[PDB]
Protein backbone atom coordinates (compact mmCIF):
# COMPACT_ATOMS: atom_id res chain seq x y z
CA UNK A 1 0.00 0.00 0.00
CA UNK A 2 0.97 3.67 0.22
CA UNK A 3 2.33 3.22 3.74
CA UNK A 4 4.47 0.35 2.49
CA UNK A 5 5.91 2.86 0.01
CA UNK A 6 6.37 5.38 2.83
CA UNK A 7 8.31 2.89 4.97
CA UNK A 8 10.23 1.85 1.84
CA UNK A 9 11.97 5.23 1.97
CA UNK A 10 13.04 4.30 5.52
CA UNK A 11 16.30 2.29 5.41
CA UNK A 12 16.71 -0.75 7.64
CA UNK A 13 19.68 -2.79 8.86
CA UNK A 14 20.32 -6.47 8.11
CA UNK A 15 22.44 -8.77 10.28
CA UNK A 16 23.93 -12.16 9.35
CA UNK A 17 24.93 -14.44 12.23
CA UNK A 18 27.37 -17.32 11.75
CA UNK A 19 26.30 -19.19 14.88
CA UNK A 20 25.68 -19.15 18.61
CA UNK A 21 27.01 -20.95 21.67
CA UNK A 22 26.82 -20.90 25.47
CA UNK A 23 29.67 -21.01 27.98
CA UNK A 24 30.57 -19.83 31.46
CA UNK A 25 32.42 -16.61 32.22
CA UNK A 26 35.24 -18.65 33.77
CA UNK A 27 35.73 -20.46 30.46
CA UNK A 28 35.85 -17.10 28.67
CA UNK A 29 38.52 -15.92 31.12
CA UNK A 30 40.45 -19.13 30.42
CA UNK A 31 40.39 -18.23 26.72
CA UNK A 32 43.50 -16.48 25.41
CA UNK A 33 44.83 -15.25 22.07
CA UNK A 34 44.52 -17.96 19.43
CA UNK A 35 42.00 -19.98 21.45
CA UNK A 36 39.44 -22.13 19.62
CA UNK A 37 35.72 -21.76 20.37
CA UNK A 38 33.09 -24.08 18.92
CA UNK A 39 29.56 -23.21 17.80
CA UNK A 40 26.25 -25.04 18.06
CA UNK A 41 25.67 -24.91 14.31
CA UNK A 42 27.19 -27.55 12.05
CA UNK A 43 29.00 -27.28 8.72
CA UNK A 44 26.88 -26.38 5.70
CA UNK A 45 23.81 -25.33 7.69
CA UNK A 46 22.08 -22.15 6.48
CA UNK A 47 23.03 -19.06 8.48
CA UNK A 48 20.51 -16.88 10.28
CA UNK A 49 19.56 -13.54 8.72
CA UNK A 50 18.40 -10.89 11.20
CA UNK A 51 16.69 -7.54 10.63
CA UNK A 52 17.35 -5.28 13.63
CA UNK A 53 18.06 -8.42 15.65
CA UNK A 54 14.99 -10.34 14.45
CA UNK A 55 15.47 -13.51 12.40
CA UNK A 56 13.45 -13.45 9.17
CA UNK A 57 15.20 -15.83 6.72
CA UNK A 58 18.19 -18.12 6.15
CA UNK A 59 20.86 -18.18 3.47
CA UNK A 60 24.14 -19.70 2.30
CA UNK A 61 27.53 -18.00 2.19
CA UNK A 62 28.94 -17.03 -1.22
CA UNK A 63 31.78 -14.77 -2.35
CA UNK A 64 31.19 -12.07 -4.96
CA UNK A 65 34.46 -11.29 -6.78
CA UNK A 66 36.06 -10.19 -3.45
CA UNK A 67 33.02 -9.75 -1.19
CA UNK A 68 31.08 -12.25 0.90
CA UNK A 69 27.44 -12.81 0.01
CA UNK A 70 24.42 -14.65 1.38
CA UNK A 71 22.28 -16.78 -0.95
CA UNK A 72 18.81 -16.88 0.61
CA UNK A 73 17.39 -20.40 0.82
CA UNK A 74 14.46 -20.66 3.25
CA UNK A 75 12.18 -18.64 5.54
CA UNK A 76 11.41 -18.68 9.28
CA UNK A 77 7.67 -19.43 8.98
CA UNK A 78 5.93 -19.36 12.38
CA UNK A 79 6.01 -23.13 13.00
CA UNK A 80 9.78 -23.38 12.46
CA UNK A 81 10.35 -20.10 14.31
CA UNK A 82 8.45 -21.35 17.36
CA UNK A 83 10.27 -24.69 17.17
CA UNK A 84 13.72 -23.05 17.09
CA UNK A 85 12.81 -20.52 19.80
CA UNK A 86 11.58 -23.35 22.05
CA UNK A 87 15.14 -24.75 21.97
Amino acid sequence: MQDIDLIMDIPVKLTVELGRTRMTIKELLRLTQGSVVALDGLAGEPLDILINGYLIAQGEVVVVADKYGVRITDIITPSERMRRLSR
Binding site: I4, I7, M8, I10, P11, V12, K13, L14, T15, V16, E17, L18, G19, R20, T21, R22, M23, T24, I25, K26, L28, L29, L31, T32, Q33, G34, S35, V36, V37, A38, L39, G41, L42, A43, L47, I49, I51, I56, A57, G59, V62, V64, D66, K67, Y68, G69, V70, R71, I72, T73, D74, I75
Partner: protein, 289 residues
Protein backbone atom coordinates in the same frame (compact mmCIF):
# COMPACT_ATOMS: atom_id res chain seq x y z
CA UNK B 1 -2.36 11.13 33.48
CA UNK B 2 -1.58 13.09 30.31
CA UNK B 3 -0.37 16.63 31.04
CA UNK B 4 1.18 19.37 28.90
CA UNK B 5 4.93 19.87 29.12
CA UNK B 6 6.46 23.05 30.53
CA UNK B 7 10.25 23.53 30.20
CA UNK B 8 10.20 25.61 33.41
CA UNK B 9 8.97 22.71 35.58
CA UNK B 10 10.78 19.96 37.46
CA UNK B 11 9.90 16.98 39.66
CA UNK B 12 11.30 15.42 42.84
CA UNK B 13 13.33 12.25 43.38
CA UNK B 14 11.69 9.99 46.04
CA UNK B 15 13.59 9.71 49.33
CA UNK B 16 17.35 9.40 49.83
CA UNK B 17 17.74 8.67 53.56
CA UNK B 18 21.34 9.03 54.77
CA UNK B 19 21.64 7.59 58.28
CA UNK B 20 25.43 7.92 58.16
CA UNK B 21 25.06 11.62 57.37
CA UNK B 22 22.78 12.03 60.39
CA UNK B 23 25.29 10.24 62.63
CA UNK B 24 28.06 12.51 61.32
CA UNK B 25 25.82 15.52 62.00
CA UNK B 26 25.23 14.37 65.59
CA UNK B 27 28.95 13.83 66.19
CA UNK B 28 29.70 17.26 64.72
CA UNK B 29 26.98 18.72 66.95
CA UNK B 30 28.65 17.23 70.03
CA UNK B 31 32.09 18.52 69.00
CA UNK B 32 30.72 21.97 68.15
CA UNK B 33 28.85 22.14 71.47
CA UNK B 34 32.12 21.46 73.26
CA UNK B 35 33.92 24.06 71.15
CA UNK B 36 31.28 26.74 71.66
CA UNK B 37 31.25 26.13 75.41
CA UNK B 38 35.04 26.46 75.41
CA UNK B 39 34.93 29.67 73.36
CA UNK B 40 31.98 31.67 74.72
CA UNK B 41 32.47 30.46 78.34
CA UNK B 42 28.75 29.56 78.41
CA UNK B 43 27.00 26.26 77.79
CA UNK B 44 25.18 26.20 74.42
CA UNK B 45 22.36 23.92 73.26
CA UNK B 46 22.69 22.62 69.69
CA UNK B 47 19.73 20.84 68.08
CA UNK B 48 20.20 18.98 64.79
CA UNK B 49 17.41 19.90 62.39
CA UNK B 50 15.86 17.41 60.00
CA UNK B 51 17.95 16.78 56.88
CA UNK B 52 16.40 18.49 53.87
CA UNK B 53 16.56 17.62 50.17
CA UNK B 54 15.46 20.43 47.85
CA UNK B 55 16.56 22.25 44.69
CA UNK B 56 19.28 24.85 45.09
CA UNK B 57 16.99 27.79 44.32
CA UNK B 58 14.57 26.73 47.07
CA UNK B 59 17.42 26.79 49.60
CA UNK B 60 18.65 30.15 48.28
CA UNK B 61 15.29 31.93 48.57
CA UNK B 62 15.02 31.06 52.28
CA UNK B 63 18.37 32.64 53.19
CA UNK B 64 18.01 36.08 54.83
CA UNK B 65 19.78 38.93 53.04
CA UNK B 66 22.55 39.61 53.93
CA UNK B 67 23.98 36.34 55.29
CA UNK B 68 27.48 34.98 55.88
CA UNK B 69 28.29 32.30 53.30
CA UNK B 70 31.59 30.40 53.45
CA UNK B 71 32.92 28.20 50.64
CA UNK B 72 34.57 24.93 51.65
CA UNK B 73 35.98 21.98 49.70
CA UNK B 74 35.58 18.38 50.88
CA UNK B 75 38.74 16.82 49.50
CA UNK B 76 39.22 14.48 47.75
CA UNK B 77 35.59 14.81 46.60
CA UNK B 78 35.01 17.39 43.87
CA UNK B 79 32.74 20.33 44.60
CA UNK B 80 32.29 23.30 46.90
CA UNK B 81 30.39 23.10 50.17
CA UNK B 82 28.70 25.97 51.99
CA UNK B 83 28.49 26.87 55.68
CA UNK B 84 25.65 29.28 56.49
CA UNK B 85 25.70 31.45 59.62
CA UNK B 86 22.62 33.51 60.37
CA UNK B 87 23.20 37.18 61.26
CA UNK B 88 21.47 36.62 64.61
CA UNK B 89 24.04 34.01 65.66
CA UNK B 90 26.92 36.29 64.65
CA UNK B 91 25.39 39.18 66.60
CA UNK B 92 24.92 36.92 69.64
CA UNK B 93 28.55 35.78 69.45
CA UNK B 94 29.79 39.37 69.13
CA UNK B 95 27.64 40.46 72.08
CA UNK B 96 28.90 37.59 74.25
CA UNK B 97 32.55 38.15 73.34
CA UNK B 98 32.35 41.85 74.28
CA UNK B 99 30.61 41.45 77.64
CA UNK B 100 27.03 41.91 76.46
CA UNK B 101 24.49 40.22 78.71
CA UNK B 102 21.93 39.71 75.93
CA UNK B 103 19.16 41.69 77.63
CA UNK B 104 18.75 44.07 74.69
CA UNK B 105 16.94 42.50 71.72
CA UNK B 106 18.82 42.55 68.43
CA UNK B 107 17.88 45.24 65.90
CA UNK B 108 17.47 44.52 62.19
CA UNK B 109 20.31 46.17 60.27
CA UNK B 110 20.73 44.60 56.83
CA UNK B 111 24.34 45.79 56.66
CA UNK B 112 27.63 44.19 55.65
CA UNK B 113 29.53 42.51 58.47
CA UNK B 114 32.43 44.45 59.96
CA UNK B 115 35.96 43.10 59.84
CA UNK B 116 35.75 42.44 63.59
CA UNK B 117 32.55 40.48 62.97
CA UNK B 118 34.39 38.81 60.08
CA UNK B 119 37.06 37.66 62.53
CA UNK B 120 34.36 36.41 64.92
CA UNK B 121 32.84 34.42 62.05
CA UNK B 122 36.28 33.03 61.16
CA UNK B 123 36.83 32.00 64.79
CA UNK B 124 33.53 30.11 64.72
CA UNK B 125 34.30 28.68 61.27
CA UNK B 126 37.64 27.14 62.23
CA UNK B 127 36.12 25.23 65.15
CA UNK B 128 33.14 24.19 63.02
CA UNK B 129 35.52 22.92 60.31
CA UNK B 130 37.56 20.92 62.83
CA UNK B 131 34.41 19.42 64.32
CA UNK B 132 32.86 18.47 60.98
CA UNK B 133 36.14 17.00 59.73
CA UNK B 134 36.45 14.89 62.88
CA UNK B 135 32.83 13.77 62.52
CA UNK B 136 33.34 12.74 58.89
CA UNK B 137 36.58 10.90 59.70
CA UNK B 138 34.63 8.26 61.63
CA UNK B 139 33.16 6.88 58.38
CA UNK B 140 35.44 8.08 55.57
CA UNK B 141 38.60 10.22 55.36
CA UNK B 142 37.87 13.78 54.25
CA UNK B 143 39.60 17.16 54.44
CA UNK B 144 37.67 20.44 54.61
CA UNK B 145 39.33 23.57 53.21
CA UNK B 146 37.68 26.99 53.42
CA UNK B 147 37.85 28.96 50.16
CA UNK B 148 36.24 32.41 50.54
CA UNK B 149 33.43 34.25 52.31
CA UNK B 150 30.53 35.92 50.52
CA UNK B 151 27.45 37.87 51.60
CA UNK B 152 25.07 37.23 48.68
CA UNK B 153 23.67 34.52 46.34
CA UNK B 154 25.19 36.80 43.67
CA UNK B 155 28.63 35.46 44.71
CA UNK B 156 27.30 31.87 44.64
CA UNK B 157 26.88 29.42 41.72
CA UNK B 158 28.41 26.57 43.65
CA UNK B 159 25.95 24.67 41.42
CA UNK B 160 25.70 24.57 37.63
CA UNK B 161 21.91 25.01 37.67
CA UNK B 162 19.60 26.68 40.23
CA UNK B 163 17.40 23.55 40.20
CA UNK B 164 20.23 21.19 41.22
CA UNK B 165 19.47 18.97 44.20
CA UNK B 166 21.32 19.93 47.39
CA UNK B 167 21.32 18.55 50.94
CA UNK B 168 20.76 21.03 53.77
CA UNK B 169 20.97 20.13 57.47
CA UNK B 170 19.78 22.95 59.76
CA UNK B 171 21.14 23.33 63.29
CA UNK B 172 19.61 25.38 66.11
CA UNK B 173 21.86 26.91 68.78
CA UNK B 174 20.38 28.13 72.08
CA UNK B 175 22.35 29.73 74.91
CA UNK B 176 19.30 31.19 76.64
CA UNK B 177 16.45 33.13 75.08
CA UNK B 178 18.69 33.12 71.99
CA UNK B 179 17.62 30.57 69.38
CA UNK B 180 20.25 31.15 66.68
CA UNK B 181 20.53 28.85 63.67
CA UNK B 182 23.28 27.77 61.29
CA UNK B 183 23.02 25.51 58.26
CA UNK B 184 25.31 23.25 56.22
CA UNK B 185 24.50 22.77 52.53
CA UNK B 186 26.15 20.23 50.22
CA UNK B 187 25.35 19.51 46.55
CA UNK B 188 24.01 16.03 45.86
CA UNK B 189 26.54 15.37 43.08
CA UNK B 190 29.42 15.85 45.54
CA UNK B 191 28.14 13.02 47.76
CA UNK B 192 26.73 10.94 44.88
CA UNK B 193 29.72 8.52 44.64
CA UNK B 194 29.39 7.79 48.38
CA UNK B 195 25.63 7.18 48.18
CA UNK B 196 25.91 3.49 49.08
CA UNK B 197 28.09 4.23 52.11
CA UNK B 198 25.73 6.92 53.40
CA UNK B 199 22.38 5.20 52.77
CA UNK B 200 22.74 1.91 54.64
CA UNK B 201 23.67 2.15 58.34
CA UNK B 202 27.36 1.56 59.06
CA UNK B 203 28.55 -1.71 60.57
CA UNK B 204 31.68 -2.67 62.48
CA UNK B 205 34.97 -1.90 60.74
CA UNK B 206 36.13 -5.47 60.00
CA UNK B 207 38.10 -4.20 57.01
CA UNK B 208 39.92 -7.51 56.54
CA UNK B 209 36.60 -9.34 56.89
CA UNK B 210 34.99 -7.01 54.33
CA UNK B 211 37.88 -7.57 51.92
CA UNK B 212 37.53 -11.34 52.35
CA UNK B 213 33.78 -10.99 51.74
CA UNK B 214 34.47 -9.11 48.50
CA UNK B 215 37.05 -11.70 47.44
CA UNK B 216 34.62 -14.56 48.07
CA UNK B 217 31.90 -12.72 46.14
CA UNK B 218 34.30 -12.25 43.22
CA UNK B 219 35.31 -15.92 43.31
CA UNK B 220 31.71 -17.18 43.33
CA UNK B 221 30.62 -14.91 40.47
CA UNK B 222 33.55 -16.12 38.33
CA UNK B 223 31.67 -19.40 37.76
CA UNK B 224 28.60 -17.74 36.22
CA UNK B 225 27.38 -18.47 32.69
CA UNK B 226 26.57 -16.26 29.70
CA UNK B 227 25.95 -16.45 25.96
CA UNK B 228 28.62 -15.51 23.41
CA UNK B 229 27.38 -14.35 19.99
CA UNK B 230 29.68 -13.35 17.12
CA UNK B 231 28.23 -11.17 14.36
CA UNK B 232 29.68 -12.10 10.97
CA UNK B 233 28.72 -8.85 9.20
CA UNK B 234 25.89 -6.35 8.68
CA UNK B 235 24.00 -5.21 5.58
CA UNK B 236 22.02 -2.02 4.87
CA UNK B 237 18.80 -2.81 2.99
CA UNK B 238 15.12 -1.84 2.79
CA UNK B 239 11.86 -3.43 3.88
CA UNK B 240 10.62 -3.93 0.30
CA UNK B 241 13.55 -6.24 -0.42
CA UNK B 242 12.78 -8.19 2.77
CA UNK B 243 9.26 -8.79 1.47
CA UNK B 244 10.83 -10.39 -1.63
CA UNK B 245 13.28 -12.80 0.02
CA UNK B 246 13.17 -16.03 -1.99
CA UNK B 247 15.34 -19.13 -2.42
CA UNK B 248 18.49 -18.40 -4.41
CA UNK B 249 18.51 -14.65 -3.73
CA UNK B 250 22.09 -13.40 -3.33
CA UNK B 251 22.80 -10.35 -1.16
CA UNK B 252 26.32 -8.85 -1.31
CA UNK B 253 28.06 -8.18 2.01
CA UNK B 254 31.35 -6.53 2.90
CA UNK B 255 34.11 -8.96 3.83
CA UNK B 256 34.88 -8.59 7.57
CA UNK B 257 38.59 -8.37 8.33
CA UNK B 258 37.86 -9.23 11.97
CA UNK B 259 34.94 -10.90 13.74
CA UNK B 260 33.70 -8.96 16.77
CA UNK B 261 32.34 -11.02 19.67
CA UNK B 262 29.40 -9.48 21.54
CA UNK B 263 27.82 -10.58 24.82
CA UNK B 264 24.24 -9.27 25.09
CA UNK B 265 25.23 -6.46 22.74
CA UNK B 266 28.51 -5.76 24.57
CA UNK B 267 31.62 -6.31 22.41
CA UNK B 268 34.35 -8.15 24.30
CA UNK B 269 36.94 -9.00 21.65
CA UNK B 270 37.76 -9.09 17.94
CA UNK B 271 38.72 -12.36 16.26
CA UNK B 272 38.90 -14.13 12.89
CA UNK B 273 36.73 -17.02 11.75
CA UNK B 274 38.22 -20.48 11.33
CA UNK B 275 37.37 -24.16 10.88
CA UNK B 276 38.62 -26.37 13.72
CA UNK B 277 37.27 -29.79 14.77
CA UNK B 278 34.68 -29.68 12.00
CA UNK B 279 33.04 -26.58 13.48
CA UNK B 280 33.46 -22.83 13.16
CA UNK B 281 36.27 -21.34 15.25
CA UNK B 282 37.29 -17.82 16.24
CA UNK B 283 40.99 -16.98 16.66
CA UNK B 284 40.99 -14.37 19.43
CA UNK B 285 43.19 -11.39 18.58
CA UNK B 286 42.47 -8.44 20.90
CA UNK B 287 40.10 -7.83 23.80
CA UNK B 288 37.86 -4.76 23.81
CA UNK B 289 39.55 -2.35 26.23
Amino acid sequence: DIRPYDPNTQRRVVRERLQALEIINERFARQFRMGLFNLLRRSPDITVGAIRIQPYHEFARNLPVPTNLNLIHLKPLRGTGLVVFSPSLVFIAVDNLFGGDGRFPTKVEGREFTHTEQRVINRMLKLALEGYSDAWKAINPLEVEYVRSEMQVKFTNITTSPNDIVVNTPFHVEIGNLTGEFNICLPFSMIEPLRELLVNPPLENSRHEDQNWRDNLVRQVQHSELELVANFADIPLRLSQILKLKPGDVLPIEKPDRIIAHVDGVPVLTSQYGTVNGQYALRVEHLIN
